[PDB]
Motif scaffolding. Structure first.
Motif, PDB file in Angstrom:
ATOM      1  N   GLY A 131       0.775  -1.221   0.000  1.00 17.62           N
ATOM      2  CA  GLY A 131       0.000   0.000   0.000  1.00 17.62           C
ATOM      3  C   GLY A 131       0.811   1.276   0.000  1.00 17.62           C
ATOM      4  N   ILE A 132       2.138   1.185   0.063  1.00 17.85           N
ATOM      5  CA  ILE A 132       3.016   2.351   0.080  1.00 17.85           C
ATOM      6  C   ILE A 132       3.658   2.484  -1.294  1.00 17.85           C
ATOM      7  N   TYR A 133       3.563   3.676  -1.880  1.00 19.94           N
ATOM      8  CA  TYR A 133       4.085   3.946  -3.212  1.00 19.94           C
ATOM      9  C   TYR A 133       5.148   5.031  -3.132  1.00 19.94           C
ATOM     10  N   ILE A 172      -1.022  14.701   4.194  1.00 22.99           N
ATOM     11  CA  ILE A 172      -2.001  13.818   4.826  1.00 22.99           C
ATOM     12  C   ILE A 172      -1.870  12.375   4.377  1.00 22.99           C
ATOM     13  N   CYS A 221      -3.536   7.902  11.585  1.00 19.31           N
ATOM     14  CA  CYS A 221      -4.987   8.007  11.571  1.00 19.31           C
ATOM     15  C   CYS A 221      -5.481   7.875  10.138  1.00 19.31           C
ATOM     16  N   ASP A 222      -6.800   7.765  10.006  1.00 18.84           N
ATOM     17  CA  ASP A 222      -7.464   7.927   8.719  1.00 18.84           C
ATOM     18  C   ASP A 222      -7.652   9.421   8.483  1.00 18.84           C
ATOM     19  N   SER A 223      -6.913   9.976   7.518  1.00 15.97           N
ATOM     20  CA  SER A 223      -6.981  11.412   7.264  1.00 15.97           C
ATOM     21  C   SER A 223      -8.383  11.869   6.891  1.00 15.97           C
ATOM     22  N   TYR A 257     -16.645   0.948   4.097  1.00 17.42           N
ATOM     23  CA  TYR A 257     -15.963   2.226   3.940  1.00 17.42           C
ATOM     24  C   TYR A 257     -16.640   3.085   2.879  1.00 17.42           C
ATOM     25  N   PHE A 276      -9.725  12.840  -0.964  1.00 12.66           N
ATOM     26  CA  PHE A 276      -8.516  13.517  -0.513  1.00 12.66           C
ATOM     27  C   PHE A 276      -8.393  14.905  -1.127  1.00 12.66           C
ATOM     28  N   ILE A 291      -2.151   6.246   7.587  1.00  8.65           N
ATOM     29  CA  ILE A 291      -2.865   5.163   8.260  1.00  8.65           C
ATOM     30  C   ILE A 291      -1.954   4.004   8.633  1.00  8.65           C
ATOM     31  N   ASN A 317       0.900  12.719  -2.102  1.00  8.86           N
ATOM     32  CA  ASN A 317       0.418  11.742  -3.076  1.00  8.86           C
ATOM     33  C   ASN A 317      -0.619  10.876  -2.372  1.00  8.86           C
ATOM     34  N   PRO A 318      -1.905  11.101  -2.627  1.00  3.18           N
ATOM     35  CA  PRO A 318      -2.959  10.364  -1.904  1.00  3.18           C
ATOM     36  C   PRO A 318      -3.066   8.931  -2.392  1.00  3.18           C
ATOM     37  N   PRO A 319      -3.741   8.062  -1.640  1.00  2.00           N
ATOM     38  CA  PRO A 319      -4.032   6.719  -2.158  1.00  2.00           C
ATOM     39  C   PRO A 319      -5.079   6.770  -3.260  1.00  2.00           C
TER      40      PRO A 319
HETATM   41  C1  LIG Z   1       2.027   7.922  -0.532  1.00  2.00           C
HETATM   42  S1  LIG Z   1       1.275   6.425  -1.170  1.00  2.00           S
HETATM   43  C2  LIG Z   1      -0.322   6.439  -0.329  1.00  2.00           C
HETATM   44  C3  LIG Z   1      -0.206   6.442   1.184  1.00  2.00           C
HETATM   45  O1  LIG Z   1      -1.514   6.768   1.701  1.00  2.00           O
HETATM   46  C4  LIG Z   1      -1.693   6.046   2.898  1.00  2.00           C
HETATM   47  N1  LIG Z   1      -3.120   5.983   3.192  1.00  2.00           N
HETATM   48  C5  LIG Z   1      -4.042   5.118   2.664  1.00  2.00           C
HETATM   49  N2  LIG Z   1      -5.269   5.329   3.073  1.00  2.00           N
HETATM   50  C6  LIG Z   1      -5.146   6.407   3.937  1.00  2.00           C
HETATM   51  C7  LIG Z   1      -6.087   7.122   4.705  1.00  2.00           C
HETATM   52  N3  LIG Z   1      -7.399   6.863   4.704  1.00  2.00           N
HETATM   53  N4  LIG Z   1      -5.630   8.136   5.472  1.00  2.00           N
HETATM   54  C8  LIG Z   1      -4.323   8.412   5.463  1.00  2.00           C
HETATM   55  N5  LIG Z   1      -3.346   7.814   4.775  1.00  2.00           N
HETATM   56  C9  LIG Z   1      -3.826   6.815   4.026  1.00  2.00           C
HETATM   57  C10 LIG Z   1      -1.037   4.696   2.643  1.00  2.00           C
HETATM   58  O2  LIG Z   1      -0.697   4.079   3.880  1.00  2.00           O
HETATM   59  C11 LIG Z   1       0.194   5.099   1.812  1.00  2.00           C
HETATM   60  O3  LIG Z   1       1.362   5.271   2.606  1.00  2.00           O
END
Ligand SMILES: CSC[C@H]1O[C@@H](n2cnc3c(N)ncnc32)[C@H](O)[C@@H]1O
Ligand SMILES: [K+]
Ligand SMILES: [K+]
Length: 547
Positions: A3-5, A36, A118-120, A148, A170, A90, A135-137
């Motif tokens: 999940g990390i990019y 975030i 946390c969940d942003s 969700y 995001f 997260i 860079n958001p997910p």
């Molecule tokens: C920078 S690559 C995307 C990053 O977003 C993070 N991420 C995924 N979902 C959430 C969320 N709901 N709130 C915060 N960070 C998140 C993942 O852990 C990853 O490190």
DNA sequence: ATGGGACTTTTTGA
DNA sequence: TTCAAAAAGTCCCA
């Protein structure tokens, strides 16, 4: 499933520089920069270095203007961590690693670091921020958990509906917690610029921030070994008098992103084109093209009095829900078990060419016509039942709307069993074919047929003539959804908005298309004559549209 | 073995 | 009851 990019360093340095380039550290030595979605800290670690240079270069001016005991070089590190750098992710391990990295930037009282695990999208943010980067997910409608999505549909409904993506929210969260006069810069997928799902998100951005710059990488591969197409959006909440967008659109999708030391060198080079767009002139659709293309697009729009939606009935192909259960090679011996009234010709997207379809190699078992399970028992036992467990997991089978052996979305046979036009759902170019052979297909091929009342104004041969032309290939790509390298989406939500015309050139255009079709169907095809006929047709179409 | 090209399923909300 | 959108695509090869 990490999940990390990792964002490329050249992109990270560009985004951080674009936000902090002209910050007045003397006027405001307490800027709040937030990521975030910080991950391991690709952006925040670079933010630290930029801030450290900023404070050190103006340390004596700060010392003179404010508390002279507070502003020392030995105190810069503590000040940055206490008041400037904020991060959220997260993932506990990523935050733990980032905390160590920020702590190790300088090697006494412990220093509090504004890192939240946390969940942003759920955190109650206690204040707004001067700068937001990162860079958001990206998670789409299939890979997002349903519970969700229920939360997103309820609290993020301004930008999140239907088949929207997680990164839409995001964008909303970043915009919401951005201070007045703040600056945001993020790298996200490019698809929201054109997609039907991104419509509400585009309205939210246009109505709440000034879009400074859009860097559109189109089909270039920014993230190694990742199937996504990227853009960089920079926006602000400043009191703007006039609101123009700088648009940098890549011209060669083949580039290696590290051709220069900085992304700025690439943007100014011949590898990119630049043009401006008036944000006040944006409709629900953002048509980000240069002046030549805009003149071209507006010329065709004004001249054409019909759209395909006006004259045609569109539909998506069959969705079996498990193709291996129902699709068989036409030479498979198992088809001796199936009565031919159950068998339909089955084509794929690659079978569609300009003007004509390749001969089908597959057969669809239209299992909806199987009345009883005791009759046609061998078809169920030896062909379809080999996937019974997988078939029973389809949503409509779990709810009892479909029997386990039925097609999930079998549509209407009569729609396919007629003369119609078919096109691939994803392609590098316009490929509209007349289907003469009652071909069925999956959702990778779309179809339409002309309404009865318009049959005397438009023929299938005329339509494929103009639709496959170089004019309409360029015309469709002006607003089409750029998916990946050399792939646009050809979906009804944009294909049906193509506008068409009829004038004095109709008969000659139709006749050229018939000649091409006749040549393409021959045994010994000489393709050369087809290309010459296409050039002559393109000249007629350009003359008709006055381009 | 990473990069690049050929090719495209069915889950899902509405 | 039944439509159509959705690439952090998917898979393979030199
Ligand atoms: C920078 S690559 C995307 C990053 O977003 C993070 N991420 C995924 N979902 C959430 C969320 N709901 N709130 C915060 N960070 C998140 C993942 O852990 C990853 O490190
Ligand atoms: K002072
Ligand atoms: K790409």
């Amino acid at each position: 499933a990490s999940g990390i990019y990792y964002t490329p360093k050249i992109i990270v340095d560009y985004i951080v520089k674009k936000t902090l380039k002209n910050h007045d550290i003397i006027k405001n030595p307490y800027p709040r920069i937030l990521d975030i979605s910080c991950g391991c800290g690709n952006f925040l670690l670079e933010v630290y270095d930029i801030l450290y240079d900023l404070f050190e270069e103006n340390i004596y001016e700060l010392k003179k203007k404010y508390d002279e005991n507070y502003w020392t070089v030995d105190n810069i590190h503590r000040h940055i961590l206490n008041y400037c750098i904020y991060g959220a992710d997260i993932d506990e391990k990523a935050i733990s690693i980032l905390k160590d990295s920020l702590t190790n930037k300088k090697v006494e009282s412990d220093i509090k670091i504004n890192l939240f695990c946390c969940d942003s999208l759920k955190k109650k943010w206690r204040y707004k921020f001067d700068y937001i980067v990162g860079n958001p997910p990206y998670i789409g409608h299939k890979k997002l958990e349903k519970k969700y999505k229920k939360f997103l549909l309820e609290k993020y409904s301004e930008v999140y509906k239907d088949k929207a993506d997680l990164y839409f929210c995001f964008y909303k969260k970043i915009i919401d917690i951005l201070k007045q006069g703040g600056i945001g810069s993020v790298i996200t997928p490019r698809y929201f610029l054109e997609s039907l799902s991104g419509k509400d998100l585009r309205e939210y951005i246009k109505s709440n921030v000034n879009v400074q710059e859009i860097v559109d990488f189109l089909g270039a591969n920014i993230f190694k070994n990742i199937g996504v197409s990227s853009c960089i959006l920079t926006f602000d909440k400043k009191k703007t008098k006039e609101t123009y967008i700088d648009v940098f659109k890549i011209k060669n999708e083949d580039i290696c992103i590290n051709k220069f030391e900085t992304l700025e060198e690439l943007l100014k080079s011949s590898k990119f084109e630049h043009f401006n767009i008036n944000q006040r002139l944006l409709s629900d659709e953002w048509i980000l093209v240069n002046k030549d293309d805009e003149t071209f697009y507006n010329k065709i729009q004004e001249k054409c009095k019909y759209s395909l939606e006006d004259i045609a009935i569109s539909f998506q192909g069959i969705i079996t829900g498990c193709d291996k259960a129902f699709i068989l090679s036409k030479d498979d011996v198992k088809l001796n078990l199936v009565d031919d009234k159950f068998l339909k010709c089955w084509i794929k997207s690659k079978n569609i060419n300009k003007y004509i379809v390749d001969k089908s190699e597959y057969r669809l078992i239209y299992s909806n016509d199987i009345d009883n399970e005791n009759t046609n028992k061998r078809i169920l036992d030896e062909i379809i039942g080999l996937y019974k467990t997988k078939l029973e997991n389809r949503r409509e089978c779990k709810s009892g709307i479909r029997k386990w052996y039925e097609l999930q979305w079998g549509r209407e046979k009569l729609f396919f069993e007629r003369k119609k036009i078919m096109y691939p759902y994803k392609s590098n170019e316009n490929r509209f074919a007349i289907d003469y052979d009652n071909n069925f297909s999956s959702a990778d091929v779309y179809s339409f047929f002309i309404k009865e009342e318009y049959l005397d104004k438009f023929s299938y041969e005329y339509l494929v003539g103009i639709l496959n032309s170089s004019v309409y290939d360029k015309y469709f790509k002006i607003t089409a959804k750029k998916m990946s390298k050399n792939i646009y989406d050809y979906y009804p939500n944009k294909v049906m908005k193509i506008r068409i015309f009829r004038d004095n050139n109709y008969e000659e255009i139709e006749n050229l298309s018939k000649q091409i079709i006749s040549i393409l169907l021959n045994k010994s095809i000489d393709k050369g004559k087809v290309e010459k006929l296409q050039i002559k047709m393109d000249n007629l179409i350009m003359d008709s549209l006055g381009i």
